[PDB]
Amino acid sequence: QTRHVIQKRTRSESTVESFFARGACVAIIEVDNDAPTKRASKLFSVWKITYKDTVQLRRKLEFFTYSRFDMELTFVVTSNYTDANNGHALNQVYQIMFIPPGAPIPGKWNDYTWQTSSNPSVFYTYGAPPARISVPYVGIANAYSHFYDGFAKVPLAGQASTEGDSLYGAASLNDFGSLAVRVVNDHNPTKLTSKIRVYMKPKHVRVWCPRPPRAVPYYGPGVDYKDGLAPLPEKGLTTY
Amino acid sequence: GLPVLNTPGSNQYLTADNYQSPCAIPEFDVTPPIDIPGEVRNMMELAEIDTMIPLNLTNQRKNTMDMYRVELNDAAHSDTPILCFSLSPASDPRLAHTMLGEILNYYTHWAGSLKFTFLFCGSMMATGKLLVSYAPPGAEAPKSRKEAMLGTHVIWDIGLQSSCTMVVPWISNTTYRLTINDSFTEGGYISMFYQTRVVVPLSTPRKMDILGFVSACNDFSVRLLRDTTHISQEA
Amino acid sequence: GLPVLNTPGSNQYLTADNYQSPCAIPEFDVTPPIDIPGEVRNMMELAEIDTMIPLNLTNQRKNTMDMYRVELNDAAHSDTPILCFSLSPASDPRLAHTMLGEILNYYTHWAGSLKFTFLFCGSMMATGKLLVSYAPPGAEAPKSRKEAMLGTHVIWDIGLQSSCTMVVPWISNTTYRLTINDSFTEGGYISMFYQTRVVVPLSTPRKMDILGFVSACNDFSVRLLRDTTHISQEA
Amino acid sequence: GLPVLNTPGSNQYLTADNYQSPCAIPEFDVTPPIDIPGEVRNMMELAEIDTMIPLNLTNQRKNTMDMYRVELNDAAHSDTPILCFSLSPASDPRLAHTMLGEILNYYTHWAGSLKFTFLFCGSMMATGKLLVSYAPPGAEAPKSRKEAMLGTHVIWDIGLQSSCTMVVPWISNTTYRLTINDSFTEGGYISMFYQTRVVVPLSTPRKMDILGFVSACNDFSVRLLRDTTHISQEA
Numbered sequence: 001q002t003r004h005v006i007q008k009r010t011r012s013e014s015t016v017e018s019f020f021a022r023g024a025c026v027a028i029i030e031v032d033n034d035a036p037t038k039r040a041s042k043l044f045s046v047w048k049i050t051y052k053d054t055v056q057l058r059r060k061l062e063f064f065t066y067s068r069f070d071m072e073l074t075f076v077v078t079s080n081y082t083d084a085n086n087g088h089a090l091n092q093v094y095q096i097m098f099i100p101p102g103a104p105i106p107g108k109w110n111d112y113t114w115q116t117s118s119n120p121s122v123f124y125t126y127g128a129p130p131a132r133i134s135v136p137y138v139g140i141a142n143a144y145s146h147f148y149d150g151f152a153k154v155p156l157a158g159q160a161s162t163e164g165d166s167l168y169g170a171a172s173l174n175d176f177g178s179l180a181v182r183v184v185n186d187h188n189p190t191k192l193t194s195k196i197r198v199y200m201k202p203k204h205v206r207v208w209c210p211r212p213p214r215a216v217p218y219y220g221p222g223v224d225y226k227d228g229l230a231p232l233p234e235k236g237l238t239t240y
Numbered sequence: 241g242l243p244v245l246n247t248p249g250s251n252q253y254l255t256a257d258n259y260q261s262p263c264a265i266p267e268f269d270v271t272p273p274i275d276i277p278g279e280v281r282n283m284m285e286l287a288e289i290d291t292m293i294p295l296n297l298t299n300q301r302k303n304t305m306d307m308y309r310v311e312l313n314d315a316a317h318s319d320t321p322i323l324c325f326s327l328s329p330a331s332d333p334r335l336a337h338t339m340l341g342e343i344l345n346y347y348t349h350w351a352g353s354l355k356f357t358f359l360f361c362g363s364m365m366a367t368g369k370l371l372v373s374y375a376p377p378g379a380e381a382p383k384s385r386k387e388a389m390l391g392t393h394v395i396w397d398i399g400l401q402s403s404c405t406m407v408v409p410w411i412s413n414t415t416y417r418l419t420i421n422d423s424f425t426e427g428g429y430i431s432m433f434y435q436t437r438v439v440v441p442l443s444t445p446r447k448m449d450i451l452g453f454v455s456a457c458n459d460f461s462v463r464l465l466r467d468t469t470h471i472s473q474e475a
Numbered sequence: 476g477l478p479v480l481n482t483p484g485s486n487q488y489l490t491a492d493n494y495q496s497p498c499a500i501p502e503f504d505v506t507p508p509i510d511i512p513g514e515v516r517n518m519m520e521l522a523e524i525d526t527m528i529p530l531n532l533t534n535q536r537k538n539t540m541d542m543y544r545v546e547l548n549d550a551a552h553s554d555t556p557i558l559c560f561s562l563s564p565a566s567d568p569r570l571a572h573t574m575l576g577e578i579l580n581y582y583t584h585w586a587g588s589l590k591f592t593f594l595f596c597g598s599m600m601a602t603g604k605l606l607v608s609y610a611p612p613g614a615e616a617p618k619s620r621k622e623a624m625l626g627t628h629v630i631w632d633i634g635l636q637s638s639c640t641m642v643v644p645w646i647s648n649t650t651y652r653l654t655i656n657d658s659f660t661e662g663g664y665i666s667m668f669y670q671t672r673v674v675v676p677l678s679t680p681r682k683m684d685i686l687g688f689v690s691a692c693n694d695f696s697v698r699l700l701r702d703t704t705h706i707s708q709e710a
Numbered sequence: 711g712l713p714v715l716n717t718p719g720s721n722q723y724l725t726a727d728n729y730q731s732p733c734a735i736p737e738f739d740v741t742p743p744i745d746i747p748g749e750v751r752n753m754m755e756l757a758e759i760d761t762m763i764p765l766n767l768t769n770q771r772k773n774t775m776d777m778y779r780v781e782l783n784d785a786a787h788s789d790t791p792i793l794c795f796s797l798s799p800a801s802d803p804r805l806a807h808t809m810l811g812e813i814l815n816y817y818t819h820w821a822g823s824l825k826f827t828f829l830f831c832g833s834m835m836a837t838g839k840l841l842v843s844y845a846p847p848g849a850e851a852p853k854s855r856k857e858a859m860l861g862t863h864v865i866w867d868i869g870l871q872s873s874c875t876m877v878v879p880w881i882s883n884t885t886y887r888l889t890i891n892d893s894f895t896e897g898g899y900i901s902m903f904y905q906t907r908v909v910v911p912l913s914t915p916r917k918m919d920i921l922g923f924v925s926a927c928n929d930f931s932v933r934l935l936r937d938t939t940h941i942s943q944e945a
C-alpha cells in the first residue's frame with residue numbers, strides 16, 4: 001500500500017541538452033615558438049577535428065547512435081618557457097585556422113595558406129580569456145553518425161586485393177576538416193612551448209537510437225577492444 | 241563609451257556556462273532533420289528500460305554470460321536466500337553496470353521507485369513459488385525468509401507467470417540518495433527465497449536459470465551531473 | 476559603470492566575425508553607383524554558365540587548346556567508350572578547372588544536378604548517333620556501351636542537332652557531396668559511346684572534334700566556404 | 711561592438727558586492743523547502759529573546775554556573791548596591807556574551823530600549839523589596855540607593871512577583887551608540903539595591919539567588935555589520 005505524495009521532482013537536468021551542456025576537452029594541440037632551424041620545435045600543428053581523441057565526451061555521445069547539434073569550441077591556451085638562459089619573450093598571438101576538407105593544409109608555419117582568405121581563423125592573444133566560436137550542424141547527412149556499420153568502398157570482383165579496401169566503419173560522414181595552429185609571432189631568442197586545449201560543447205542537441213554505453217576501454221576510432229575485458233568485479237550471489 | 245564596470249568572474253571560462261559566441265561559418269545552409277525513429281529527449285528514458293542484472297558475480301561467472309543467470313533447482317524447501325543485493329543502483333556491483341546504473345553514475349543524486357523483474361527460464365513443466373523481498377535499511381539484512389517476509393515482498397508463481405515484477409517504492413529519509421555507497425543514504429536490501437520449492441516431473445531438467453532486470457519507474461529523477469568512474473583514459 | 480562580465484571569446488579576432496567598427500573616414504560623400512551591366516548576386520550564377528571541359532588531358536594535349544577537343548572518326552562501330560570521366564566536379568581533373576569546378580573548390584559541400592552539353596564540330600555532311608551515359612556509383616565503371624546503356628543515358632543524333640544536353644540529376648546517399656575525391660560521396664561515372672557510327676560522304680573530313688561543356692542546374696548549391704588549392708604564393 | 715568605457719572599480723572583488731554570476735550547475739532540480747518550525751527572518755529576533763546575564767564575574771565564579779547567580783541574604787537593610795554594571799550591551803563583560811551582546815558584536819552601531827528582567831529564586835516564604843535603577847550617564851555612578859533612586863527605577867516586591875522587568879528606555883545624545891566602550895556614547899549605569907530587606911521566617915534558607923536576563927525591545931536596531939572579537943582562529 002502507498003500514500004498520496006504530491007511529487008515535485010523534475011527531470012530538468014537529465015534532458016539530452018543538459019546531459020551534454022558541458023565543455024569537454026577533445027584535444028591538446030602542442031605548438032612551439034622557436035627558431036625555424038631547430039628541427040625539434042613544431043612551429044605549427046594540424047589536428048583532425050574529432051571527439052574520439054578523448055573518452056569522456058566520446059562515451060556520452062556513444063550512448064546514442066545518431067546525433068544532431070551545433071557545436072561550441074572553446075580554446076584554452078597555455079604557454080611556458082623551456083629554458084632560463086636565453087632571455088624573455090613578448091606576448092604571443094596564436095592563429096587557429098579551420099581547414100575544411102579539401103582546403104590546402106599548411107606545410108610551413110608561414111606559408112601562403114595562413115592568409116586564410118576563405119578559411120575561418122581565430123587570432124587569440126595570450127592572456128585573453130579562452131577563445132570561443134560556434135558552428136551549426138554541418139553534417140552532410142541529416143544527422144551525425146556515431147556508428148557506421150559499413151564501408152566507404154565496396155570491393156568489386158576482378159579488383160586486386162589492394163583495390164576496393166577501406167576501413168570498416170570509416171565514412172566521410174565524420175570528415176569535418178582540421179585545425180591548424182601556429183604562433184604568429186616571430187621567434188624570440190628563447191624557445192616557448194604552448195598547448196591549445198580544445199573544449200567541445202554540443203548545443204541544441206537531438207539524439208536517436210540509444211545504445212548501451214562503452215563498458216571496456218576504447219581501442220581506436222572504432223568499436224574494437226583489446227584490453228580490460230573484465231570490468232565486473234567479484235561479488236557473492238547471496239552477499240548484500 | 242557606455243560606462244561599464246567589470247565584475248568578478250569576468251574573463252573566466254566556466255565549462256558549464258551558456259553564453260553566445262560568434263559563428264565561424266555564417267550563413268551555412270544546414271541540412272534539415274529527418275524523422276529518424278527512436279528519438280530520445282531525456283536520459284531517464286534510457287533508465288526506464290529494463291536491462292539485465294549481472295546477479296551472479298562469482299569468480300567463475302563474472303565477465304561471462306553466466307553472470308546474468310541465477311540457478312534454481314528442485315531441491316527440498318529451505319529458507320536460505322537464492323540471491324541478495326543492496327539497493328544501491330549506482331554503486332552496488334550488480335546494479336552499477338546496468339543501463340540504469342550507467343546513467344546514474346553520471347549524476348550525484350537520484351530519487352524514485354525501481355522495478356525489478358525476474359524471468360523464469362526453466363521448462364514449461366516446472367512449477368514453484370518464490371518470495372521477492374525489499375527490506376528498507378536500518379536493520380540486519382534478511383538472513384532467511386522469516387526476516388525477509390516482514391519487509392515489502394511479492395509471491396511469484398513461476399508456473400503461472402514466467403515473469404514477476406516487484407516495484408521497490410521510493411522510501412528514504414533524504415529526498416535524494418547519493419550515487420555512491422553511503423550509509424546515511426543507504427537504500428535497503430533485495431533478496432529472493434523459495435516460497436515452496438521448484439517442482440519438476442520426471443524427464444525434466446532439475447536445474448534452471450532465472451534472469452534479473454532492473455529499470456527506473458516514471459517517478460525517477462537524477463541531479464548534479466558528474467563524470468563517471470566507468471571510463472578512464474591512460475597516458 | 477554598468478556591471479559587465481567578459482565571456483570567453485572576448486578580445487579574439489575571428490576572421491569570419493561580423494561586428495561594427497569605427498569609420499576611419501567619417502562623413503565621406505560616397506560616389507553613388509551606376510547601373511553597370513552584368514551584376515552578379517550569387518556565385519552560383521557563375522556556376523550555372525556552361526564552360527568548356529578539358530576532356531583530353533593526354534601528355535601531348537594537356538595545357539593546350541587540343542585538350543578541349545575530343546576526336547571522333549567515321550570508323551566502323553564499336554562499343555568502346557569515346558570518353559570517360561568521374562562525376563567529381565571539384566576534384567576530377569577534367570572538371571576541376573571548369574568555372575563550376577573553380578567555384579566548387581572554394582566550398583566544401585556541393586549538391587544539385589549538372590548539365591553536360593556536347594557540341595559536334597564536324598561538317599554538315601557528317602551524320603551519326605552517340606550515346607551519353609551517367610552511371611550512378613557502386614558498380615564497375617561502364618567498360619562498354621552494353622553496361623553504360625543500363626544507366627541514365629541520352630541518344631544524340633549529330634545529324635539533327637549539333638548540340639546535345641544531358642542532365643545528370645542529383646542522386647546521392649548524402650544530402651551533400653564533398654568537393655574532394657571521396658569514396659563515400661563519389662558521384663558516379665560519365666561516358667560517351669558510338670550509338671551507330673559517324674558517317675561521312677566522299678570529299679569530307681573523316682575525323683572531327685566534339686567539345687564538352689559543364690554547368691550547374693538551378694537546384695545546385697554549395698556550403699562551407701574554404702580556401703582553394705588552385706592558387707598558391709611562394710616565399 | 712557597443713562602445714564601452716571601463717570605469718574605476720572595474721575588475722575589483724568587493725566582498726560586499728551583489729552581482730550576478732554564472733550558475734555552475736544549470737537546470738538543477740532544487741529540493742523544495744518544508745515548513746520547518748522556528749524560522750528566523752532578522753537577527754534582532756534573536757536579540758529580543760531574554761538570555762541570562764553572567765552578573766557575578768568574580769575570580770571564583772567566572773566561567774562557572776555560579777557566575778549567573780547573584781546572592782541575596784536576609785541581613786539588615788543597607789543602601790549599598792547588590793549589583794552594578796554599565797549599559798554597554800556589546801562591551802560590558804556581563805552583557806557582551808549574552809545573546810544580545812553576541813549579536814551586537816557583529817554590528818558597529820546599536821539603538822533602542824533594553825529589557826532587564828530579574829528572577830528571584832528564594833523560597834516561597836521569603837519576602838522583600840528591591841530597587842532596580844538606571845542612571846543615564848554624565849554623573850557619578852550611583853554609589854548608594856540615595857543616588858540611584860534619583861534616576862529611572864522600579865520597586866520590585868519579591869513576595870508578590872518572582873520576576874521583575876525594568877525597561878531601560880533609549881536615551882542618548884547620538885542616534886546610535888557604538889558597540890565598544892566609548893565615553894561619548896556611554897549608555898549609563900544599572901544598579902540594584904535593597905528597598906527594605908529580604909525577610910525569611912525560621913527554618914528557611916537565609917541566602918538565596920537572583921538571576922538576571924537581558925533582551926532588546928521592539929524598537930531596537932543595529933547597523934554597520936562587522937566581524938566580532940568573540941571568535942578567533944590560530945595558525
Ligand SMILES: CCCCCCCCCCCCC/C=C/[C@H](O)[C@H](N)CO
Nearest residue numbers: 051071097098120121122133144176264
Ligand atoms: C576560426 C576557425 C576555428 C573554428 C571553426 C571550427 C570548425 C568546426 C567545424 C567542424 C564541426 C565539427 C562538429 C563536431 C564533430 C563530431 O565528430 C560530430 N558532431 C559527432 O557527432
